[PDB]
């Protein structure tokens, strides 16, 4: 399995646990989200950083647009 966590409609805590799960086998985890879930992706990354793995570093943040309608995307890479 890869190291990506797709942030969608589930409650923030579910993704916080999914990110912790990925961080058990990887030193890097990629959080991706689109549209209104972008703010939840940031909440998730901030929670990991603030409360669980305080030494965690944000290796990369990239924004873009996906698809007859455009939708904003964010990708946040967390690294130990």
From Swiss-Prot:
A single GO BP term for this record reads: chromosome condensation
Kindly give the SUPFAM superfamilies that the UniProt entry links to this protein: AlbA-like
Ordered alphabetically, the record's keywords are: Acetylation, Chromosome, Cytoplasm, DNA condensation, DNA-binding
Q: Where in the cell is it found?
A: Cytoplasm; Chromosome
Name positions with the PTM N6-acetyllysine.
Answer: 9
Q: Name one GO molecular function term.
A: double-stranded DNA binding
Superkingdom classification of source:
Archaea
Quick one: signal sequence residues?
none
Cellular component terms (Gene Ontology): chromosome; cytoplasm
The entry's comment on post-translational modification says: Acetylated. Acetylation at Lys-9 decreases DNA-binding affinity.
Q: Does the keyword DNA-binding apply?
A: yes
Tell me the protein family, please: Belongs to the histone-like Alba family.
Q: What does this protein do?
A: Binds double-stranded DNA tightly but without sequence specificity. Involved in DNA compaction.
Protein name per the record: DNA/RNA-binding protein Alba
